[PDB]
Design a binder for this molecule. Structure first.
Ligand SMILES: Cc1cc2nc3c(=O)[nH]c(=O)nc-3n(C[C@H](O)[C@H](O)[C@H](O)COP(=O)(O)OP(=O)(O)OC[C@H]3O[C@@H](n4cnc5c(N)ncnc54)[C@H](O)[C@@H]3O)c2cc1C
Ligand SMILES: C[As](C)(=O)[O-]
Ligand SMILES: C[As](C)(=O)[O-]
Ligand SMILES: [Mn+2]
Ligand SMILES: [Mn+2]
Length: 536
C-alpha cells in the first residue's frame, strides 16, 4: 500500500518506498519514505523542507542496530523521511600535517572503508568495533567501541584512544538552526558546543567528521577454548589462566560463553615481527565458522523458533563445538596481521540476535571482581530457571573491556569528552579508567528472555552502585526493559537522565546536552516519539 505523497518535495531528490526492520526484526515497518542526499547541502534542503511541512528527518546508516531512534515499532511514519547517508555522503580524505594525522569522512562512510584508507598511509585506530559495516555517523551516535586496552607497560601511541570512536573527533559538520533557517555549521573540538554532538543518538544530523589517527600496528589474535569458565572468570588474584592476567599481559580480550557450556571461547589480542607460531592474514573476518552456519545448527534454531526453547542446553554445546572444530580446521587459533584485519571479525551475515546487559565503569584493578560477580550471578540464574523447566537464555554471555574517553588521548585543543557517552570519565572517580561490557545475547522471540533482561538490568543497577563501580546501559543494545526493550517508562524518562547527571557538573551533563540539541533543532525535525521521551 502506497504512503501519502509528500507535499512539494524537492524535485531533484528522488524518493522511494522501502520496508524498515531493526537487526532482530523486533521493529518491522512495511513502508517508509527513503531518499539518498547527494551532498551535505541536500540534507539542508531536506531539513528546511521538513520544517515547512511538519515532517521529521532521520539519518539512515547501515541499519546494523536495535534501538527505536530511527523508527519506532508500530509508528505512523506518513510524515517521516529517512535520509540514507551511505550511498553518496561517503567521501574519505587523509590529512597528514599537524599536531596529529587525521581523516575526514562523510557520515555515511563505513568504518571499514575509513580504516582501509588509513592503512594505505600507515595509520590506524586502536579500539575498533567488531563489525566493519557500520557507518561512522551511526558508530559515533552510540560511542562505538571495541575490546582494546593497552597491556601493562604499553604506552598509548599519539593519536590513538582506548575509549570510544567519539573521543577521536577533531571537528564535525552538522545541519543546524541558525535563527532563521537550517544551514551547515562546523565545530572544532575546542568549542564548548561540540561535546553533546560527539555522541548524539541521532538527535543531530552529522554530514561529515574529522578524526585523529595514530600509527598503524601489527597485532596477534589468539583463541582459547580449553579454559573452564570458573578458571577464566575467577576472583581477584586467582591461580591459572584468568581474564585479568590476559588483560595485564596483552591488553585486548573478549570472552564468548555459550549457554550450558563448560568452556568459553576466549580471544586475546597482543600488539607486536610476526610470532613464529601465528598465521599471517591479509584481510578481516577470519572466523569462517561464525559467518556461516551448517544444517544441524540451523535446524536447532528453526526448532527453537517453532516453539521448542528446551533445545537451549543442546544448542549451547553445539555452538561451542562448531567454534572449537572450526578454529582448528581453518588454523585460526593464532593469527596475526594489521589492526583492522584482526579486530574486524563480525560480518553482516552473522546470526541475528538481541542483547541485554551493559557497561560497568570502574578501575582497572577491579576487573576480576566485576566479571566474577556477573558470571557467578548469571550461572546461578540460568540453572535456577532450568530447574523450573524454563529456558529464557539460548545465546552467549559476551564480555570485553576497553578504556574511557581520556583527555590525554586527544592531541588537538579540546574542551573535553563526549557529554553523554557511556565511556565518559567520571570526575568524582579519577581512578575509574575502564569500561567493562557485560552482554547477554539471545534468539529473538524467546519466551521469558526480555523478562530476564529486565531482571538483569535491575540487578546490575543495584549491584554496581558504589565507590568502586557504577553501571551504564550500552546505548546500542537493549535497555529500559519493561519487559520489552525501550518500554520501561521510568527508565526512559527518569533513570537515563539520572545516570548522566550523576557525578558530573551541572555545566556539562544530560541537561546541558538536551539544551544544546534543542538550540540546534528547536523545531524537533531530527526526532521521533521515542526521542521525545528520552531527550525532551
Ligand atoms: C551484530 C552487530 C555487532 C555489533 N558490534 C558492535 C561492537 O563491536 N561495538 C560497538 O560499539 N557497537 C557494535 N554494534 C552496535 C552498532 O555500533 C550500533 O548499532 C550503531 O549505531 C549502528 O550504526 P549504523 O551505521 O548501522 O547506523 P543505523 O542503525 O542506521 O543508526 C544507528 C544510530 O545512529 C544514528 N545515526 C546514523 N547516522 C547518523 C548521522 N549521519 N548523524 C547523526 N546520527 C546518525 C541514528 O539516528 C541511530 O541513533 C553492533 C551491532 C550489530 C548489529
Ligand atoms: C560484539 As557485540 C556483544 O557488540 O554483538
Ligand atoms: C550509591 As552512589 C553515591 O556510589 O552512586
Ligand atoms: Mn549511583
Ligand atoms: Mn573503594
Amino acid at each position: 500500500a502506497p504512503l501519502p505523497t509528500p507535499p512539494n518535495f524537492p524535485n531533484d531528490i528522488a524518493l522511494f518506498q522501502q520496508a524498515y526492520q531493526n537487526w532482530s526484526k523486533e521493529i518491522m515497518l512495511d513502508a517508509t519514505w527513503v531518499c539518498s542526499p547527494k551532498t551535505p547541502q541536500d540534507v539542508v534542503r531536506l531539513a528546511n523542507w521538513a520544517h515547512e511541512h511538519d515532517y521529521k528527518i532521520r539519518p539512515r546508516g547501515a541499519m546494523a542496530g536495535w534501538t527505536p531512534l530511527t523508527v519506532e515499532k508500530g509508528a505512523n511514519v506518513e510524515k517521516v523521511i529517512l535520509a540514507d547517508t551511505m550511498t553518496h555522503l561517503n567521501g574519505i580524505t587523509v590529512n597528514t600535517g599537524g599536531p596529529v594525522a587525521t581523516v575526514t569522512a562523510g557520515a555515511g562512510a563505513s568504518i571499514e572503508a575509513i580504516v582501509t584508507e588509513l592503512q594505505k598511509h600507515d595509520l590506524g585506530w586502536a579500539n575498533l568495533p567488531a563489525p566493519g559495516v557500520l557507518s561512522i555517523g551511526g558508530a559515533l551516535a552510540v560511542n562505538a567501541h571495541g575490546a582494546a586496552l593497552p597491556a601493562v607497560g604499553q604506552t598509548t601511541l599519539p593519536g590513538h584512544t582506548y575509549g570510544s570512536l567519539s573521543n577521536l573527533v577533531t571537528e564535525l559538520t552538522a545541519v543546524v538552526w541558525n535563527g532563521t533557517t537550517y544551514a551547515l555549521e562546523t565545530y572544532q573540538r575546542n568549542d564548548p558546543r561540540i561535546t553533546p554532538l560527539l555522541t548524539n543518538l541521532g538527535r543531530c544530523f552529522l554530514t561529515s567528521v574529522t578524526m585523529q589517527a595514530g600509527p598503524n600496528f601489527r597485532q596477534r589474535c589468539q583463541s582459547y577454548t580449553d579454559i573452564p569458565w570458573r578458571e577464566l572468570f575467577a576472583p581477584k588474584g586467582a591461580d591459572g589462566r584468568t581474564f585479568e592476567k590476559f588483560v595485564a599481559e596483552s591488553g585486548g580480550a573478549e570472552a564468548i560463553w555459550y549457554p550450558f557450556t563448560e568452556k568459553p571461547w576466549m580471544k586475546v589480542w597482543t600488539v607486536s615481527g610476526k610470532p613464529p607460531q601465528a598465521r599471517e592474514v591479509s584481510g578481516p573476518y577470519n572466523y569462517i565458522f561464525s559467518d556461516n552456519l551448517p544444517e544441524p545448527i540451523t535446524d536447532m534454531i528453526g526448532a527453537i523458533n517453532a516453539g521448542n526453547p528446551g533445545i537451549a542446553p543442546l544448542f549451547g554445546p553445539a555452538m561451542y563445538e562448531i567454534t572449537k572444530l572450526g578454529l582448528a580446521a581453518t588454523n585460526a587459533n593464532d593469527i596475526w596481521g594489521w589492526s583492522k584485519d584482526v579486530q574486524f571479525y563480525i560480518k553482516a551475515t552473522t546470526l541475528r540476535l538481541t542483547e541485554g546487559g551493559g557497561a560497568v565503569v570502574t578501575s582497572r584493578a577491579n576487573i576480576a571482581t566485576v566479571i566474577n560477580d556477573f558470571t557467578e550471578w548469571f550461572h546461578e540464574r540460568i540453572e535456577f530457571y532450568r530447574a523450573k523447566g524454563e529456558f529464557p537464555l539460548n545465546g552467549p554471555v559476551e564480555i570485553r573491556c576497553c578504556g574511557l574517553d581520556q583527555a590525554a588521548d586527544v592531541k588537538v585543543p579540546s574542551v573535553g569528552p563526549p557529554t553523554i557517552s557511556a565511556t565518559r570519565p567520571r570526575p568524582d572517580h579519577p581512578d575509574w579508567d575502564v569500561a567493562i561490557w557485560l552482554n547477554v545475547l539471545g534468539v529473538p522471540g524467546t519466551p521469558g528472555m526480555f523478562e530476564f533482561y529486565r531482571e538483569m538490568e535491575q540487578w546490575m543497577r543495584s549491584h554496581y552502585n558504589n565507590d568502586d563501580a557504577t553501571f551504564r546501559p550500552e546505548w546500542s543494545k537493549g535497555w529500559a526493559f519493561g519487559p520489552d526493550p525501550y518500554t520501561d517508562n521510568d527508565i526512559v524518562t527518569n533513570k537515563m537522565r539520572a545516570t548522566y547527571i550523576e557525578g558530573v557538573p551541572t555545566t556539562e551533563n544530560w541537561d546541558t546536552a538536551r539544551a544544546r540539541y534543542n538550540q540546534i533543532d528547536p523545531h524537533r525535525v531530527f526526532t521521533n516519539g521515542f526521542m521525545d521521551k528520552l531527550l525532551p
